[PDB]
Amino acid sequence: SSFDVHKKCPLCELMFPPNYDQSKFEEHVESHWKVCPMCSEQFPPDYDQQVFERHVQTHFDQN
Ligand SMILES: [Zn+2]
Ligand SMILES: [Zn+2]
């Protein structure tokens, strides 16, 4: 017997131990999210790639 409090990231199929730091989970979960490298913005998986690409691309048409 033991606590099965395994945190599973909805974005993937990976199971994390109960001693897993939430902060690390946030980063992992966010890792799957669409993030702009020109400013460092986070875009949810449900977001529209068109809007994201426009935002990221917006960073290429202006320095
Ligand atoms: Zn994940
Ligand atoms: Zn950006």
Curated annotation (Swiss-Prot):
Effect of residue 60 to A: Reduced affinity for ubiquitin
PTM summary: Phosphorylated in the C-terminal region by CHUK/IKKA leading to NF-kappa-B signaling down-regulation.
Tissue: Expressed in all tissues tested.
Signal peptide range: none
Chain sites annotated for binding Zn(2+) 1: 9, 12, 28, 32
Binding of Zn(2+) 2, residues: 36, 39, 55, 59
Transmembrane segments: none
Function: Ubiquitin-binding adapter that participates in inflammatory, antiviral and innate immune processes as well as selective autophagy regulation. Plays a key role in the negative regulation of NF-kappa-B and IRF3 signalings by acting as an adapter for the ubiquitin-editing enzyme A20/TNFAIP3 to bind and inactivate its substrates. Disrupts the interactions between the E3 ubiquitin ligase TRAF3 and TBK1/IKBKE to attenuate 'Lys63'-linked polyubiquitination of TBK1 and thereby IFN-beta production.
Subunit field text: Homooligomer. Interacts with TNFAIP3. Interacts with STARD13. Interacts with MYO6. Interacts with TOM1; the interaction is indirect and is mediated by MYO6, which acts as a bridge between TOM1 and TAX1BP1. Interacts with MAVS; this interaction induces MAVS polyubiquitination. Interacts with TNIP1. Interacts with TRAF6; this interaction mediates deubiquitination of TRAF6 and inhibition of NF-kappa-B activation. Interacts with RIPK1; this interaction negatively regulates RIPK1 ubiquitination. Interacts with NBR1. Interacts with TBK1. Interacts with RB1CC1. Interacts with SQSTM1.
This protein's name: Tax1-binding protein 1
